Amino acid sequence: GAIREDTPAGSVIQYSDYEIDYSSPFAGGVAWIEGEYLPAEDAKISIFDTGFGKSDLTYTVAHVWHGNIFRLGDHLDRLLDGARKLRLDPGYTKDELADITKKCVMLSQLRESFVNLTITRGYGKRPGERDLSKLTNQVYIYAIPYIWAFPPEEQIFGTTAVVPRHVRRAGRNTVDPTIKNYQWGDLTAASFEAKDRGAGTAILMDADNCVAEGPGFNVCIVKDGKLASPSRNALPGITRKTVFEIAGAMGIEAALRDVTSHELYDADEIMAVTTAGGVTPINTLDGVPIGDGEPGPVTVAIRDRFWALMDEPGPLIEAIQY
Amino acid sequence: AIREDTPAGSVIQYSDYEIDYSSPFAGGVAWIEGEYLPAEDAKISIFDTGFGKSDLTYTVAHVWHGNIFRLGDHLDRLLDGARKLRLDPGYTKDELADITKKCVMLSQLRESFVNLTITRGYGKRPGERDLSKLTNQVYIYAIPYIWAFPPEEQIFGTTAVVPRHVRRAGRNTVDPTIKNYQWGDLTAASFEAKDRGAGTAILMDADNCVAEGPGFNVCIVKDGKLASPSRNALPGITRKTVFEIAGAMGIEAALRDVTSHELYDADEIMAVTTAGGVTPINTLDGVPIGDGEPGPVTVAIRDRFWALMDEPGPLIEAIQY
Amino acid sequence: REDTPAGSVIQYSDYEIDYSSPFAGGVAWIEGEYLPAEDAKISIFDTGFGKSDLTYTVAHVWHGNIFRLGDHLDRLLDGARKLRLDPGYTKDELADITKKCVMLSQLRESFVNLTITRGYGKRPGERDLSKLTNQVYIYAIPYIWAFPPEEQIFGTTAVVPRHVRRAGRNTVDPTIKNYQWGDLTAASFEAKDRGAGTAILMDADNCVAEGPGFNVCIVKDGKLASPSRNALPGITRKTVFEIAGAMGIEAALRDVTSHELYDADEIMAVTTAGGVTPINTLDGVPIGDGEPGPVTVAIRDRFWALMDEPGPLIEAIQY
Amino acid sequence: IREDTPAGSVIQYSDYEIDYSSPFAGGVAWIEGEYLPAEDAKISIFDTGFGKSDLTYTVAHVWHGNIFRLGDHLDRLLDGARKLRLDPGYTKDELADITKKCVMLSQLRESFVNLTITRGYGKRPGERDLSKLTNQVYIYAIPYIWAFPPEEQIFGTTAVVPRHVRRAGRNTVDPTIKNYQWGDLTAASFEAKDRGAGTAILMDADNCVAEGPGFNVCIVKDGKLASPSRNALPGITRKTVFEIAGAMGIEAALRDVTSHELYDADEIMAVTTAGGVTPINTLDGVPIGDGEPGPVTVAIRDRFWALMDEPGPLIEAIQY
Ligand SMILES: O=C(CO)[C@@H](O)[C@H](O)[C@H](O)CO
Ligand SMILES: O=C(CO)[C@@H](O)[C@H](O)[C@H](O)CO
Numbered sequence A: 001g002a003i004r005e006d007t008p009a010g011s012v013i014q015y016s017d018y019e020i021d022y023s024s025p026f027a028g029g030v031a032w033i034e035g036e037y038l039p040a041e042d043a044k045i046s047i048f049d050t051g052f053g054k055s056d057l058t059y060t061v062a063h064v065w066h067g068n069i070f071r072l073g074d075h076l077d078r079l080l081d082g083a084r085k086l087r088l089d090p091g092y093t094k095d096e097l098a099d100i101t102k103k104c105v106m107l108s109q110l111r112e113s114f115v116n117l118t119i120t121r122g123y124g125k126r127p128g129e130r131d132l133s134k135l136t137n138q139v140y141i142y143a144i145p146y147i148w149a150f151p152p153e154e155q156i157f158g159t160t161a162v163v164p165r166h167v168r169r170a171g172r173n174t175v176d177p178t179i180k181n182y183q184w185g186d187l188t189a190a191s192f193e194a195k196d197r198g199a200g201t202a203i204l205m206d207a208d209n210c211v212a213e214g215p216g217f218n219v220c221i222v223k224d225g226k227l228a229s230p231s232r233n234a235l236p237g238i239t240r241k242t243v244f245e246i247a248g249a250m251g252i253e254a255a256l257r258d259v260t261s262h263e264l265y266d267a268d269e270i271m272a273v274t275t276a277g278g279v280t281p282i283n284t285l286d287g288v289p290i291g292d293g294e295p296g297p298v299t300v301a302i303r304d305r306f307w308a309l310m311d312e313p314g315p316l317i318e319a320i321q322y
Numbered sequence B: 001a002i003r004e005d006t007p008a009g010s011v012i013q014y015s016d017y018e019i020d021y022s023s024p025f026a027g028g029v030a031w032i033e034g035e036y037l038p039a040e041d042a043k044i045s046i047f048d049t050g051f052g053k054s055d056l057t058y059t060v061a062h063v064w065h066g067n068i069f070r071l072g073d074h075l076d077r078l079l080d081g082a083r084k085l086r087l088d089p090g091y092t093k094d095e096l097a098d099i100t101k102k103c104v105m106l107s108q109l110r111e112s113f114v115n116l117t118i119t120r121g122y123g124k125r126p127g128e129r130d131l132s133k134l135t136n137q138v139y140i141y142a143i144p145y146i147w148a149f150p151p152e153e154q155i156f157g158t159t160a161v162v163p164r165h166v167r168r169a170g171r172n173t174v175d176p177t178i179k180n181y182q183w184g185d186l187t188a189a190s191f192e193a194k195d196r197g198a199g200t201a202i203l204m205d206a207d208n209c210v211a212e213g214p215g216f217n218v219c220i221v222k223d224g225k226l227a228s229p230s231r232n233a234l235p236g237i238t239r240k241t242v243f244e245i246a247g248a249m250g251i252e253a254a255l256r257d258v259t260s261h262e263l264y265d266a267d268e269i270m271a272v273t274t275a276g277g278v279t280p281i282n283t284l285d286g287v288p289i290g291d292g293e294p295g296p297v298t299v300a301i302r303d304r305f306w307a308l309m310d311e312p313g314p315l316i317e318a319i320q321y
Numbered sequence C: 001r002e003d004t005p006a007g008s009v010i011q012y013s014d015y016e017i018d019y020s021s022p023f024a025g026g027v028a029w030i031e032g033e034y035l036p037a038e039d040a041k042i043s044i045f046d047t048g049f050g051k052s053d054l055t056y057t058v059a060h061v062w063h064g065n066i067f068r069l070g071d072h073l074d075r076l077l078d079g080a081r082k083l084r085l086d087p088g089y090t091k092d093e094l095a096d097i098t099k100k101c102v103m104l105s106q107l108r109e110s111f112v113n114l115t116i117t118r119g120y121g122k123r124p125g126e127r128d129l130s131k132l133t134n135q136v137y138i139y140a141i142p143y144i145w146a147f148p149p150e151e152q153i154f155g156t157t158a159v160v161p162r163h164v165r166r167a168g169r170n171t172v173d174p175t176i177k178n179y180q181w182g183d184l185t186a187a188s189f190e191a192k193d194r195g196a197g198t199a200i201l202m203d204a205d206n207c208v209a210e211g212p213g214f215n216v217c218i219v220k221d222g223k224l225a226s227p228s229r230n231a232l233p234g235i236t237r238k239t240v241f242e243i244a245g246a247m248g249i250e251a252a253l254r255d256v257t258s259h260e261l262y263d264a265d266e267i268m269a270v271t272t273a274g275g276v277t278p279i280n281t282l283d284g285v286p287i288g289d290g291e292p293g294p295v296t297v298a299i300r301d302r303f304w305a306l307m308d309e310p311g312p313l314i315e316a317i318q319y
Numbered sequence D: 001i002r003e004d005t006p007a008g009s010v011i012q013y014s015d016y017e018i019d020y021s022s023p024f025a026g027g028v029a030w031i032e033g034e035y036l037p038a039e040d041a042k043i044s045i046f047d048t049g050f051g052k053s054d055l056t057y058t059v060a061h062v063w064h065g066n067i068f069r070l071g072d073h074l075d076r077l078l079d080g081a082r083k084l085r086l087d088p089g090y091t092k093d094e095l096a097d098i099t100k101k102c103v104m105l106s107q108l109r110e111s112f113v114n115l116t117i118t119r120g121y122g123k124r125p126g127e128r129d130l131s132k133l134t135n136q137v138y139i140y141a142i143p144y145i146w147a148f149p150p151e152e153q154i155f156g157t158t159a160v161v162p163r164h165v166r167r168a169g170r171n172t173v174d175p176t177i178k179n180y181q182w183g184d185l186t187a188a189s190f191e192a193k194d195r196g197a198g199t200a201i202l203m204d205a206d207n208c209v210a211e212g213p214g215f216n217v218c219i220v221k222d223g224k225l226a227s228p229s230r231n232a233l234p235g236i237t238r239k240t241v242f243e244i245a246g247a248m249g250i251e252a253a254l255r256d257v258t259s260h261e262l263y264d265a266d267e268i269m270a271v272t273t274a275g276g277v278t279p280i281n282t283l284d285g286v287p288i289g290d291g292e293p294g295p296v297t298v299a300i301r302d303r304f305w306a307l308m309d310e311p312g313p314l315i316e317a318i319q320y
């Protein structure tokens, strides 16, 4: 399996130059399942894990770029906070999960990597146990080659979006988007609608015609040199957190607030932000260019800064010891 | 256990039989990636997007006294939803039926919970995102009978609350009209019902119409007529059976919007699901429905439902063990 | 009167009004008195104003015939019951006063409004509902078109709002006819801004609700459907379903999803104020061939014929 | 006119005599450019402010002869009118002059004051073109209206969350622009009355607190104040409450308040022009804290009433 793919020449996005030693069976991808390190290709879970049958779980995703894992501490904090709200117990400390995660990456030998930690309600002594008190919660962790929500070419030159005609985001009182979850029924439906409409992605609205988020990303808009991102029906994203910190360092006002359907359509810039590929300019909405139809200046400034962070020793990154 | 206690003399009784545990299939079978496995060995790829995106549909049938109930109706529903999700099981209705009946026959269970699941599946590499590159998977299993409500509550009734904090996901979000594993709202509602000391929750939709419950449809009776939600609810096969029973009894039955006012004013409320049948709901938010005991229409339909499992006819098929 | 298309099924009556009557052209009945429409005034302290605490119905008169007045009175009084309003008159008394307004107006084509408000007490600013006297206001004025005659015959255009949805049955309930048009007014402004004839609003689950002053019906594969939930139970819709049945056309009150609206073979607006309006395009996309559909035309032409045919649906005003 | 208030409480009507030889005594409306006695105030049945409730308004109170925050009221009224494409055809200063004259002619020292801007009517009844409708301004000053009785202001009221009704969302009948469209509020009030409660607190579509029938809701938890930011009127009483909270060193946030946070609150209060700050002792029959007015609610309520007598920029004495 490829550990690299093309990125625009000279751009802020470049994979590491290195060779993996495939004499190790862990080379290229690792999972940690029921306390054992496995080749990613061998990684299997009980079909009776209620994380399958009820999607009764939470998770987080972190990236590794140039051998640096990005904000793992913040990822573990959000994961464990969510698990606590779901009455889940990983049975491992934050530092224990940090060491297991870093070991997955190290065994993979991947310098660019998509890293998942999942906590499930789990399974009991026999299949089809339904008393939560009898289910042993499971931790599953994996590190695999880098995943792009949008290809490198779109990270640099922009993607396109539609607002679905047929779908809205599940609200915080249904399948709660503020706890990261695998329940993508609405997100999958929106993505199918964007693909059918020839667009790169979908931006979903909440029940009150406020911007929610997209399938695997938060949305930020810029209007009159100010940045806004949805406060209610949206994951509290760590990329969004990073974007707000960059904006403050640049003297750009950044508010978490309701962004109405009016404000989305009237935006000077629209961007997608996510762990899986960073900051994506959205050049077009429902076939209408935003600004001049190319990546906006705040979006370009913040994106370029984001990728620079992956090479600057400091609290946001930790070097994997390969 | 292949059995649990049921109220003595009640319409609910497990079969009296011995399983041969020399078979590694005894008590539980799964069919995964084209192979029959002991249930305890049944594992799937972590990279199946049926896990990472819950991108799948399923159905559940029951086996009672060695008889599988409305399997053809379950496969029709399963395959119709799969077509709506752009999934392809890569097996015919008849092929899935044979594989399903073989899982039960190998389990040796006369009372069984039978699941068929169709997932978007996995590509050649973990982290394939391109749907055209994902090979859809079928997983089938037959395990001991599962009760959405204990047998004691099937006969004596359960208690319900309407969540203060949760609503059922709408058909335009995580669509409840296609059976799915995305129980975020249903799990939250169950925890609230448990926190309040109730047997279960009845969730409303965005317009304060009844949706359904965690693993069941709701039916009400008012002035001798039955009604069940049409919009934000699974089209249940137990509900289908209940409407047929009602028809045969001369009782009008409508699939329609049931408002919050109508739920609270109901003469009777009942839960209906594959996993345990027809459950009387005695109280709603601590207020007795009728006299706070199983209603007369509910009892008549529940008892008729169980009688169907022993009557030769087109709704049942005997597993040939 | 105003222009209608030459030779079409819509034609005003040929007659002259005697303007020696101060009632000629418009009559209201307010606080037990018939008045010229030009003089019809209500107390500002009617809570029908300050809380929009009221229901109403609208009937039309065409060629001197009032259409389904009994059904209109039934619907008005049923909603007034749900609102705990009491008009303090019987159905037959209201029917007599209604026909008298039309007669005094001399209008052969007329828009007829019956409103029941929560009313006012002895003191402005009375808030105790038990101390408010409910009020009945009735008027008959020249015919009002939700769509012009030209659009009745040749069709209009619609958009689905980007920014607005219909209030649900559990908020400001559309199943009880009301003056609370905040959403409908926002949707109409959005359609105007977007160069469209009108708006079709969605409910919270992306099911068709209705439009600003009309129900929506679709045709798909020769079958008619109209929303069952977040929509007024229209008397034009009731008529359309009776016409469809008599034509051998299957007609269902059910949820119509956003998918089914956009995929429809035909779309129509139905309302008392102008009848059955073909909708040629939705968000700029032609419905069928972008001209009034065959079911829509058959039902619209039948609807206008019902106005002139003696029977239970019509009663001739005695002028 | 006055009614009983609790003896020695922070709420007391003025002691004074109206001269009823003026026909304006006790109540005045300003309709179609004419000052009228309230009893004679009538509007065209064809104003689309009636038939479409196509209007906005605001309500100010007069207490001890002082009108409270009229400029804020006028700013909020006119901002909402611009959003509705309404034009009063009067300046903020002209509307202020007309408002204060209604109060002066009424002789009321305690008054409920309404300013309404409607889409209006055309030359013909039933005119269908908005561009041909002349927008109307209607203003009145009448005796003080209480959302909750003085006894409840001092000793607290009770509330329920409706089983059957929710607040209309900002994308339907928008609660962020003051309106007469009370269909949900009226239904909620009927359900509270059926359940024997003082009032209803409505939720939005996501089970966040919206507001009540004529008031904003504020909660206190762990000594901090919160009030809904989305589906709720931007109240001037709420604005005052937040200024009073800041002055007292009490953290106050406009934010989503979940249904969890409402039921878990240490204090709940109703805030509105028509009676001020009302303690809510009980929710769905369960005591909030000890089932008596909470300490933050009492300190803010008493401060709010003291404001009506302190010379300062929030009040203007009516020159009778
Ligand atoms: O592209 C995606 C979806 O795959 C990213 O948003 C990321 O993967 C998410 O964290 C989990 O899938
Ligand atoms: O997981 C379950 C069992 O709890 C459900 O999928 C199943 O449908 C059952 O019919 C209701 O419990």
Ligand SMILES: O=C(CO)[C@@H](O)[C@H](O)[C@H](O)CO
Residues within 6 Å of the ligand: C058, C144, C145, C146, C212, C213, C214, C271, C272, C273, D128
């Ligand atoms: O039938 C009606 C009654 O309201 C509406 O269609 C009418 O057109 C509206 O009152 C004016 O637009």
Ligand SMILES: O=C(CO)[C@@H](O)[C@H](O)[C@H](O)CO
Residues within 6 Å of the ligand: C050, C127, D059, D145, D146, D147, D213, D214, D215, D272, D273, D274
């Ligand atoms: O300001 C208010 C809110 O109280 C008034 O709009 C209302 O008419 C009356 O108080 C409600 O009963």
